[PDB]
Swiss-Prot record, chain A:
Its cofactor is Mg(2+). Keywords: Lyase, Magnesium, Metal-binding. It comes from Aspergillus terreus. Mg(2+) 3 binds at N207, S211, E215. Optimum pH is 8.0. Disulfide bonds: none annotated. (2E,6E)-farnesyl diphosphate binds at R302, Y303. One of its GO terms (molecular function) is aristolochene synthase activity. It catalyses: (2E,6E)-farnesyl diphosphate = (+)-aristolochene + diphosphate. Binds 3 Mg(2+) ions per monomer. It holds the Pfam family Terpene_syn_C_2. This is Aristolochene synthase. Pathway: Sesquiterpene biosynthesis; aristolochene biosynthesis; aristolochene from farnesyl diphosphate: step 1/1. It comes from the Eukaryota.
Length: 306, 295, 292, 295
């Protein structure tokens, strides 16, 4: 009942996905405290490093693991917060922020704390400038996750606006630039803000589409606010008074419109003499994120489960 | 350039459309007060009766003409109120209500008055109970033809909820019941509320999609609202809304099936909901081909 | 504790409240099925008198009766499916119209029947004018509303069309024998929406605490989240907003007169809505109906 | 007259306002290329250093002048960016960024460049770590100065949430911190995020209240939004919004007491939060007296 409408975007996968997914995953299964075997198995099932390689297929060969580690740990935390109140979730996230900047050593007895620490240390050690560029976008993401807006009345327009942060658009962009060693100037970024905003809705909604059942479930099982159902699928379903599945099919078509928009905005940037080689590398990178994201969402067992 | 997405519905026109169209067009040409032979021609090509037959293809052969005459005069009046101030238009349609009720005689020298009077008298003579039943729906609409809107911040959900209560669609719905001789019980009409709301939105959004081009010139339409909430062109919005409409057609069938899967469907209801199906496909063909949205 | 801001509206109470209250409350106690029950402690007849201080002396009992049964029926409904109740009320409508006879062994039925027969026997034409308003309300008390993202503007627009408030409006016209022409009943659309909104928000302000015993959908919660202030702070701001609607009421009135003349009826009606707003406020502040 | 509701807050002006205003105004009168005598009288009568001392009455005595200079050049530039295109404007501010950084040398023949350059060099000389601390907030403000406003459906909650994140207000908070010598850690800052959000909103709405008539000659303001949402006049809306501002004032006091009650109120934060309180009362006095809102 969810045949993806046609797209001109073809995703790519990083050639070293096999290797990277091996180390990363082993690492977490080794240091991350698992509730039980049933959890560590589902962990391996989600395929977090394959998402990373799907998202950043053109990443440099020695930087793709950094990306798989950060997204993995963020996913792991992402779920943890669902059983917490906005207040608890916020405190959990806030203690990790100083640790991410490396201003507070981690309680080595708490995996989430030293994992976060080592990871960011590893990245700064590899490339400080770019590493540091990911810090505030990650912090932006983290604070959106438990933001009070999560409960206030919100239509499609306002939701897409809040989702940009909660989906971590900026974090992914900076992660992509870091991983590809793609440096852009403070004026090259400004030139692509419409492109980034457009891409953020696409990532967000495609994810909302496939993660709806999972969220509907934790909605009825997790914490009252932590697992609050906040998604475009529910919003559009209610606004149009159709089923969630109908909403998915309409939202999917809308995503294609954002894809067209992406192509149009890029041609625009290219039309006016503004498309620099770095930007070309970037905008094409965003496309990979949108297609990679969709492909993973269509397959991962993280979205096909109880 | 706007290509409609696939649909299980298809437009249908009343069998006697040719016959009735001549009958009703003639009558108004004979009685309506067109300012010139130009407007007359324009009127003939507008074919208000052909549109009516497109919307009520299932109307009874001897009732369909009442429907074309009613919409024809309402439409002529609609177009007429355009060139009238709001205070003027209101008193204009307001004088026609007692006349429509038959409580007040018409000045046989003012055509709108005697045409309205005679039309309603003829409707009651055919089916008093059913004619009386569409009095208020017509009046609610006539009074709406002249009131304002008063702008306010409004999103997709708000706009759609507002169109679900569109009195114009309620009129079309009531007039169709009269045309088909469908005497629905309050109990029957209550169980058909979701379907009616669903249908009303589809007719309204399809209008929006095709009227956008026209309306845009110098405000409240699903096309502009969706484009700004999703930050896409109006044209992209039209394509998404079109798919949404196909979703409402699917909801329509699901709802009809659920009503039937229960001991709720009724002979009248079965005919009623199918009638709505044709109003939706009918309205889409009209929106796609009417001059009302041209240029 | 929550000081309502200054108001130029003074509520009044119907002269016969005491006489009407005994009769109607008595009549219901001597006929209604709700077994223990704080009925005579429940305004109902006294609340109706706060809303229609100027109802005709021989029609006030009709209003108290209509609202008492509607509110008791509304109280019942909470014990039945949205369809057991839907059918429940859907049965009463033909009885209400006089078409169907009442099962004389069923309280709600003969009371419904007797009541409407009385109203028609007193003022047939006007009694019929409110048949629909009541039907809208009854049908409206069992239906379900589909959840939707609702901001303050959406919520307020919704309350502008509150069927309960439209019922109070029509019933007031009936109770005061005010016969408005569709022309006049078109000249006050704004005054009515503004009044309905005022009645609704005042109820919201006072019912918030009890209601929180829970989803909600109240201006209090909606404004607190949009402005990110406590519910108590939202009540104050909403209360001022209410004083602004009171002010707008006086403006829409002064305007109407200055316009194509008020009318003796409209002058009466409009003063009536004012009593509903002020009356509704005093009632909201004192009813146990909002007690925790 | 509006008649502002009671407030436990009051406006205060920096003790050295006369001195600093004369000093700063003088500097710009000598260096800034004013088109004509009328532009010079307008500049002195607008008193930007005076406004600045009203916002940061608690600034350290030897730092208030930097704030006056920074806000003065920023607003002179602001008024200028309106007479040039988004591209001319963006290129204009983008050229000043590396210069404000001290990375590009100014062309001494162009006032705005050496004025900007010398200004940031002096700030760094006085407190380089703190001066470096306000670079981004200023650049974020500068870039926002030429940004294109997205017109979309927006209710009260949406508009306020949007104002909670105003870059101009973050600039004010950042500049105040520099002016008060308040070196607050990221952790201390995070503790007052609800206070900053609350404050930013108060500032924006009070501006909204007083700038409305001028805005009324894509109007995005709380006055129009609340007026349409509650269906009242703009004047009534201003009135309700003002009360809402006093509620945000009480909220500010409650958040400050919590901060202390949880043992999280350091000396700097106590100084900071009181600073914000004067930004609210100061902005209010300014909004009621500035010619920028005349007509
Ligand atoms: Mg999640
Ligand atoms: Mg999440
Ligand atoms: Mg999701």
């Amino acid at each position: 009942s969810l045949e993806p409408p046609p797209s001109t975007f073809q995703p790519l996968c990083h050639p070293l996905v096999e290797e990277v997914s091996k180390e990363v995953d082993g690492y977490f299964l080794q240091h991350w405290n698992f509730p039980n075997e049933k959890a560590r198995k589902k962990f391996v099932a989600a395929g977090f490093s394959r998402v990373t390689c799907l998202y950043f297929p053109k990443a440099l060969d020695d930087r793709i693991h950094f990306a798989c580690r950060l997204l993995t740990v963020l996913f792991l935390i992402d779920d943890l917060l669902e059983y917490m109140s906005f207040e608890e979730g916020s405190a959990y996230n806030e203690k990790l922020i100083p640790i991410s900047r490396g201003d507070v050593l981690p309680d080595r007895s708490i995996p989430v704390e030293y994992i976060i620490y080592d990871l960011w240390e590893s990245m700064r050690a590899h490339d400080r400038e770019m590493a540091d560029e990911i810090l505030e976008p990650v912090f932006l993401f983290m604070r959106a996750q438990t933001d009070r807006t999560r409960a206030r009345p919100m239509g499609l327009g306002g939701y897409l606006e809040y989702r940009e942060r909660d989906v971590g658009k900026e974090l992914l962009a900076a992660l992509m630039r870091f991983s590809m060693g793609l440096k852009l100037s403070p004026s090259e970024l400004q030139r692509v803000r419409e492109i980034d905003a457009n891409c953020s809705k696409h990532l967000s909604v495609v994810n909302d589409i496939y993660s709806y059942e999972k969220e509907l479930y934790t909605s009825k099982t997790a914490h009252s606010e932590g697992g609050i159902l906040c998604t475009s699928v529910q919003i559009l379903a209610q606004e149009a008074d159709v089923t969630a599945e109908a909403a998915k099919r309409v939202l999917f078509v809308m995503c294609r419109e954002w894809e067209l928009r992406h192509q149009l905005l890029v041609a625009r940037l290219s039309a006016e003499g503004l498309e620099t080689p770095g930007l070309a590398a970037y905008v094409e990178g965003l496309e990979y994120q949108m297609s990679g994201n969709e492909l993973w969402s269509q397959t991962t067992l993280r979205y096909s489960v109880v």
